[PDB]
Amino acid sequence: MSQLGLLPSTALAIGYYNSFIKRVCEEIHGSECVELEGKKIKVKSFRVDVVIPETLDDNGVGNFTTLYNKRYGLSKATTCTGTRGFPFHFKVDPPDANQESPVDIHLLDIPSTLSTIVESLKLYLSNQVGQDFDMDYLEMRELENFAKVLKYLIGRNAATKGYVNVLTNVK
Amino acid sequence: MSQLGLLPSTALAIGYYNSFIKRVCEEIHGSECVELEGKKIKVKSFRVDVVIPETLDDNGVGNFTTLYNKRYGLSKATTCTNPALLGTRGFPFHFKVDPPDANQESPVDIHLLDIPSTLSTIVESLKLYLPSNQVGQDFDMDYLEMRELENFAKVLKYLIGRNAATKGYVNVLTNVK
Amino acid sequence: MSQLGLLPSTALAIGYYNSFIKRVCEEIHGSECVELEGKKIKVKSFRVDVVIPETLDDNGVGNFTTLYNKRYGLSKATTCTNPALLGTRGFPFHFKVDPPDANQESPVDIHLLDIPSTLSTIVESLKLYLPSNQVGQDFDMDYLEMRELENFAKVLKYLIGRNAATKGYVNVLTNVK
Amino acid sequence: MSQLGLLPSTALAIGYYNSFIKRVCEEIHGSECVELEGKKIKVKSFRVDVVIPETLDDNGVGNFTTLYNKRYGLSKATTCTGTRGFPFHFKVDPPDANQESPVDIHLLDIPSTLSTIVESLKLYLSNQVGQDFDMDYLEMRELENFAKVLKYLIGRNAATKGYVNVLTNVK
Amino acid sequence: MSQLGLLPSTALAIGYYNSFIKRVCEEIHGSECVELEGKKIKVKSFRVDVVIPETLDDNGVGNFTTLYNKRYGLSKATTCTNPALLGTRGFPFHFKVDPPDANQESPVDIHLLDIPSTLSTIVESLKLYLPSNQVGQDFDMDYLEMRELENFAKVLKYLIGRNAATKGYVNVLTNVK
Amino acid sequence: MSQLGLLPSTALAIGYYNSFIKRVCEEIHGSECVELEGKKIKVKSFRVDVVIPETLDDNGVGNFTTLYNKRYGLSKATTCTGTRGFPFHFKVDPPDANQESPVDIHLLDIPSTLSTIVESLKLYLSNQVGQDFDMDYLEMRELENFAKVLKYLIGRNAATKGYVNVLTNVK
Ligand SMILES: Nc1nc2c(ncn2[C@@H]2O[C@@H]3COP(=O)(O)O[C@H]4[C@@H](O)[C@H](n5cnc6c(=O)[nH]c(N)nc65)O[C@@H]4COP(=O)(O)O[C@H]3[C@H]2O)c(=O)[nH]1
Ligand SMILES: Nc1nc2c(ncn2[C@@H]2O[C@@H]3COP(=O)(O)O[C@H]4[C@@H](O)[C@H](n5cnc6c(=O)[nH]c(N)nc65)O[C@@H]4COP(=O)(O)O[C@H]3[C@H]2O)c(=O)[nH]1
Ligand SMILES: Nc1nc2c(ncn2[C@@H]2O[C@@H]3COP(=O)(O)O[C@H]4[C@@H](O)[C@H](n5cnc6c(=O)[nH]c(N)nc65)O[C@@H]4COP(=O)(O)O[C@H]3[C@H]2O)c(=O)[nH]1
What are the binding positions for 3',3'-c-di-GMP in this chain (chains A, D, F)? Predict the structure, then answer.
């Protein structure tokens, strides 16, 4: 089990689940379509993977997110809607499919909230510039806690259980 | 002098600034345009107000956000993403036109009104930081909630003060409704 | 009198002068021309201002530089490199024309405005020299930051005064915005 | 472990990484093209080698940089863009390739910031003209510290990790 | 009186006179013709001024020299070398024509303006004579620099006064700019 | 090791290096061509030999310089260019080579600054006309100091290191 700590892996995981993963899953289940490039596409079924990098960059996970999106053929799409949508990166299970017919979708998201952890660590613990085993252990433990909490929370909602997966220690 | 605590007001504020406020401010500064219903509008000058609710609801700030967004005009738009950078995503937000009747084709001033959704996390942490066996008005819960909202606002003010991209372009509205 | 210290305002100022200010000044003195959007433009009389920000942002002077370069005209050009010397690289910079509407064909004055990007390093050294466990205005950090900016400006002024190439052709604007 | 010192090898390395290496790596990743002689060439991939000379000259690393660019067929090119470009020296991984098609580029940069170290040494330590073993050791240690800090910082950002190499003690 | 010292203003002045001023004056007196762009021009009456800068730059008189030679006309020429004597080399210098618009074919009065490059060495000696751990305006450095420049000028004056070849044809301009 | 003295070997060597040797080497490296009798010749590679004569003549090294240039087939050439050229005496590595093609050049220079030392010696110490072993020792030591300082400064700049040699005690 996980508990609230001084550096927020549990709370950030809870916020990420309740603000993005739960909401995006519910929106896809309800509307059953995603809007990209000004045009809608139906979703036969969605599988969303949250990718937790093995190590966080000094300046946040934005660079890793951009490189990961470049590596694969990920395309941007928002959840169709006084409430805002949720842009995300996804790929179609087959290389391509007829747009008019519904197409299964493979959402991929690198949690931007992980950037906060970096910041928190800068406050949590230095006047040295080098590999610090204490801070490395802290990063690894916080990433593990984030993944564990997110998995447990996904194991609660029928709208996300089975449809959401966690891929930790990527690259 | 805010810092880290078991209740992550400081960390959530830092994340909100470095993920949405800073990113949105930089994107609007650079592109000088936003996207609404798929069509672009150039932005002459923008301004963002972070509306911190006076008190957080039981189920997050979603209901307050949705009621505040339609009590005012606050049409939904997204900050444009250049075709060059495929990895970066867009940041949807809610905005009004400071002159309500303005030429969309011409450059237009925009007022960005965003209620930090990350505050919802605070609520979901209050149930964990100080679990309550009883249901009803708790004077300790309210004190912690107000203290952490104030910490959030103070952290946002400080962070906005330390960036020319956002300094003077972002204001934090505290104790709204 | 400024000397070496843990915070490298002196060393960074020396490097900035010897690598950009001196090099650009000598290149414009010799070639008497610059490269705007790839096209040659002759320089009649140039002059450089080193815009030292009053306070450095959290993430370096990048955002302040990018907002300053567009608040004013400050189109981007590069100091030309002759084909004979292949090794030497060009130094891009931002400049305006003192008469904004001037014939590019004929020799034209240019006002070079450069916010030293090296100042960013100072910020990244403040996080090392005096680490802080808390986020918020620190009156000790502000003192060190302003002292280091003052040292940078003073060293730049001195080094400019000791070279006919840069003496009088370079000005240090301190405490800007 | 590297910390701030009186003669700035660590701070100069941090500035070099955050101002040139990181910025150039991200710009190449994003734009995926470099402008040379005023015309663009696409970049399938890039490798950035930062060359730390064995010994810094008395007047700075400028002469070594010019000689290095002369010895190899390195060509000048900026990063396409109120922000400026980053001119650099690069070489294409075959002898030549069709410009229309994307071509891999091997950037080679001798950090000009190393010049500052020379100046710093002049302030750090003499009224003599000869091989000063004390200053020689100081220069060697500063070059080693610069290389170590730059390697560590390269190993942090996903936009430079694996794509940037450090060649220390060259010639 | 001027004598030898650790800072070699006297020795450098002696070398400058015996190597450039005396040689150039004697060669112009004899040949009465110089070489501009490879083309011979006859000299009717010449005169040399040794422009001693008021203050020496940090990196030698190179920048001041090349900026003075361009602020005024001062086209570069070289004293002609007779084909008979192969061993002797030429002495390039910068000169203008006292009447700016004069016939090159006919004899022409020439004004030779030379900023002693040897003064650069003095700077390189001041760093050795009185090493400084700090960078900034030093009142002791300035005194030594001005004293050495004045000694250089005085030695040049004396040496010129002692030779009919250079007496009355060479003037030392002290404290220029 | 060398330091400033009353009769300037070190300062004269520094001036010779920074005013002729460094400048000439840099200009040859840059322009890669030398002008002789008004026509340019490309330089494939250059070697600069600075000759320190065994003993300085009474009137200076000018007469020795003329004799040395007479002995060999040295030819005059300036460095192409508000900066002046640097006339010098050079020789082609082979007996002759095609003008159009680049040709190696063995620049040969007898430092005229050495003449100054003679005058310096006249001021350093006599009312006799004869062999003064004291003055001979001073002259030899000063020539050694000049050669040592010039050798050291040559191995400091990458533009002159390896391309410049010092031939002390010639004839
Ligand atoms: N692909 C994708 N992921 C999303 C989106 N919204 C949230 N997330 C993820 O969920 C984290 C926390 O969301 P939050 O509680 O709503 O709290 C958010 C939220 O209140 C605000 N924010 C972030 N992005 C946006 C946005 O695009 N529009 C608006 N109006 N607010 C945003 O900043 C706070 C912190 O954001 P992060 O630290 O980066 O971390 C976010 C992010 O990793 C989305 O629209 N698309
Ligand atoms: N407008 C303009 N300013 C210039 C330029 N080059 C240097 N500066 C300024 O001079 C400072 C020191 O440069 P550096 O010592 O040669 O040492 C630099 C250099 O080694 C490298 N670097 C910086 N910019 C470039 C570039 O544009 N091209 C290449 N190839 N290297 C660069 O990073 C070091 C530190 O950079 P900074 O922190 O940014 O700080 C730079 C920067 O503020 C230029 O081309 N244009
Ligand atoms: N305008 C002009 N001025 C001249 C010329 N030759 C000498 N001078 C001046 O006389 C000073 C002393 O010359 P040096 O004793 O023969 O001793 C000189 C000489 O051995 C050598 N050197 C300097 N310039 C040249 C050159 O142009 N050609 C050659 N072959 N050697 C040079 O470096 C020594 C010190 O040079 P500096 O520090 O520059 O200082 C030089 C320089 O200021 C000349 O041809 N044209």
Answer: 19-20, 84, 87, 109, 112-113
CATH of the domain at A114: 3.40.50
Domain span at B75: 9-176
The arrangement of strands across the sheet holding D105-109 comes to: D39-42, D33-36, D75-79, D88-92, D105-109, D46-53, D164-170
Q: To the nearest whole angstrom, how far is the Cα of D82 from the nearest Cα of chain B? A: 8
Separation CA A20–CA A22 (nearest Å):
6
* Nearest atom (ligand 2) to Cα of C120: 38
Backbone angles phi, psi at C78, to 5 degrees: -135, 145
Q: Reduce the secondary structure of chain D to three states and give it as a string.
A: CECCCCCCCHHHHHHHHHHHHHHHHHHHHHHCEEEECCEEEECCCEEEEEEEECCCCCCCCHHHHHHHHHHCCCEEEEECCCCCCCCEEEEECCCCCCCCCCCCEEEEECCCCHHHHHHHHHHHCCCCECCCHHHHHHHHHHHHHHHHHHHHHHCCCCCCCCCEEEEEEEC
Domain membership flag for residue B162: yes
Radius of gyration of chain E (CA): 17
Q: Is D29 exposed, middle or buried (0-12, 13-18, 19+ CB in 10 A)?
A: buried
* C116 within domain boundaries: yes
Question: Atom 1 (ligand 2): residue with closest C-alpha?
Answer: C93
- Nearest ligand 3 atom to the CA of F89 is 30
Q: Is D63 on the interface with F (CB under 8 A)?
A: yes
Q: Per the domain annotation, does C2 fall within a domain?
A: no
Going by alpha carbons, the residue nearest to atom 23 of ligand 1 is B20
Structural domain includes residue B111: yes
Number of domains in chain A: 1
CA–CA distance, E79 with E28 (Å, rounded to integer): 7
For residue E50, give the nearest of E143, E156, E139 by alpha carbon. E156
Amino acid sitting at position A140: M
CB < 8 Å to B3, chain C: 133-136
Residues after which chain A is broken (C–N above 2.5 A) are 81, 125
Q: What is the resolution of this structure in A?
A: 3.3
Is B128 within 8 Å of chain C by CB? no
